[PDB]
C-alpha cells in the first residue's frame, strides 16, 4: 500500500513569462491588460462631448456667422473638432495667443454669451459686414465705421457685475489702401486702446495690401482677454477698432480635451474615452491610447500582461 503527493495538470494552453523563462505553461492565468474599445465617441461620467463638425473653437468664440447654432450656449465633457470644421476666422487675420485661447475654452465645461457693449452706445456705424464672412460679420464684435462722414472718438465702458469672469474679444482692422482707411474711419492715423484695471493695450493701424486670403487684401488682427469679476473694461478709438459686442462666461471644468478626429459618435456612455473609441473594464491596464481620459485603467504600451494564478502545467505523458 502507498500514498503519494501530487499536483494538478490541465489542458490549459495558458502561458506566462518570468525573467528566467518565457512561455511557461500554467494551469490558470489572468490577463491584466484590456485591449478592446467600441470605436465610438461617447459620453463619459461628465456628460456628452461638444462635437464641432463645421466650426472651429475660435470660430465659435468669435461668432463666425456660419456658427449660429452655437450662439445659445453649450456644456460638455470634452470637445471634438472634425476635419470638416473649417469655419474659423472668416475675415483674414490671426488670433493672438490662439493655443492659449483654445486651451482655456476647452478646459471649461460650458459657455454662455453676455452682451458687453449695446449697439446703442456708439455714435458711429456698427453694421459693417464682409463678403468673406457670408456677407455678414462676427456675432462677438462690431465693425465700427464712420457715420455721416464722421468718426468721433468712441469711449465705452463696461463693468463686470456678473460674479464670474468674462472672456471678451476685439480686433484691429488694417485696410489694403489709404482710400479705404479714410473712407471707413475719416482719418489715416488712429489710436485704439483696450484697458481694464489690469491691462493697458493700445493699437495703431498699418495700411497696405497683404497677400490674398478669402479674396481680400485687408486684415484684422484678433485679440482676447478675460474681465475678472468687479473689473471694468474700457475701450477708446477714433478708427480701426473691431469692438467687443458679446463676451463669454466660461464655467466649470471638463476633461479639458480637444480631439481632432472623424471617429463616429454614438448614443453611448463609457467610463474611459480615447480618440480611438471608449471602454469599460475592471482590469488595471489597457493599451488603447495614452490619451485616454475619464475613469480609466493605466495605459501600458504592450500586447499582453498575463499574470500567473495557477501552477506550472506539467503533462504526465
Amino acid at each position: 500500500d502507498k500514498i503519494c503527493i501530487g499536483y494538478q495538470s490541465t489542458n490549459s494552453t495558458e502561458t506566462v513569462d518570468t525573467l528566467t523563462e518565457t512561455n511557461v505553461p500554467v494551469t490558470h492565468a489572468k490577463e491584466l491588460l484590456h485591449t478592446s474599445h467600441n470605436g465610438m465617441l461617447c459620453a463619459t461620467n461628465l456628460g456628452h462631448p461638444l462635437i464641432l463638425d463645421t466650426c472651429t473653437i475660435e470660430g465659435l468664440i468669435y461668432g463666425n456667422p456660419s456658427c449660429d447654432l452655437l450662439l445659445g450656449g453649450r456644456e460638455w465633457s470634452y470637445i471634438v473638432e472634425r476635419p470638416s470644421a473649417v469655419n474659423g476666422m472668416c475675415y483674414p487675420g490671426n488670433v493672438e495667443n490662439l493655443e492659449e485661447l483654445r486651451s482655456l475654452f476647452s478646459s471649461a465645461s460650458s459657455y454662455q454669451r453676455i452682451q458687453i457693449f449695446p449697439d446703442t452706445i456708439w455714435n458711429v456705424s456698427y453694421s459693417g459686414t464682409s463678403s468673406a464672412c457670408s456677407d455678414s460679420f462676427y456675432r462677438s464684435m462690431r465693425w465700427l465705421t464712420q457715420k455721416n462722414n464722421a468718426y468721433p472718438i468712441q469711449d465705452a465702458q463696461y463693468t463686470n457685475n456678473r460674479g464670474k469672469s468674462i472672456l471678451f474679444m476685439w480686433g484691429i482692422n488694417h485696410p489694403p489702401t489709404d482710400t479705404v482707411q479714410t473712407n471707413l474711419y475719416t482719418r489715416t492715423d488712429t489710436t485704439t486702446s483696450v484697458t481694464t484695471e489690469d491691462i493697458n493695450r493700445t493699437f495703431k493701424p498699418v495700411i497696405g495690401p497683404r497677400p490674398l486670403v478669402n479674396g481680400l487684401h485687408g486684415r484684422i488682427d484678433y485679440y482676447w482677454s478675460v474681465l475678472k469679476p468687479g473689473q471694468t473694461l474700457r475701450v477708446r478709438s477714433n478708427g480701426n477698432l473691431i469692438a467687443p459686442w458679446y463676451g463669454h462666461i466660461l464655467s466649470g471644468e471638463s476633461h479639458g480635451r480637444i480631439l481632432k478626429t472623424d471617429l463616429n459618435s454614438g448614443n453611448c456612455v463609457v467610463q474611459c474615452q480615447t480618440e480611438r473609441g471608449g471602454l469599460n473594464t475592471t482590469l488595471p491596464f489597457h493599451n488603447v491610447s495614452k490619451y485616454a481620459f475619464g475613469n480609466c485603467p493605466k495605459y501600458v504600451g504592450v500586447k499582453s500582461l498575463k499574470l500567473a494564478v495557477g501552477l506550472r502545467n506539467v503533462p504526465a505523458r
Partner: protein, 160 residues
Amino acid sequence: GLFGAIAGFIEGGWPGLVAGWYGFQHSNDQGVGMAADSDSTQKAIDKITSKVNNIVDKMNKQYGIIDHEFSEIETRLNMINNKIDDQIQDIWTYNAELLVLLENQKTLDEHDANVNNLYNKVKRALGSNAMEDGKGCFELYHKCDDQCMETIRNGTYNRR
C-alpha cells in the same frame, strides 16, 4: 524549480486531480484514487486571490496626458512636453512589465513550496512506517485501508 517538487522530483502533474492544485493519491486493496487537499489548496487560493486584488488596486491608477497644441515658435516646449510624456509611458510600462514577470516567478515557486511542504508534512507523520520511492510516494510498511489513508490525509496518523 526552487523548491524541487513541481516538475522536480514529483515529475508530472495529475489530470485526474480536478478539485484543486495539490492532493493525494492512495493505493491499497480497495483500489486507487486521488483527491485534492482542501486545507493547502484553499490557503493557496486565498493568497493568490489577495495578490491579484492588490496588484489591481495598486496598478489601476491612470496618468493624464493631454495632446497640447503648440505654435510654430514653441518647438522647444513641444519637445520638452514630448520628453515628459515619453518617459511617463516608458517608466510605467517598465514598472508594469517587471512587476508581472517577477511576481509570476514568485507565484510559480510558491506553488512548488506548497507541494514541498505538504510532502514533508506527510513524510514527518509517517516516520519509519514508510519509505520514500523518490517520486513523491510513500510505500507503507503496513497494510493501510481507506480509514488508515484518511488519518494520513487529515493529519491524525497514529505512528508518527
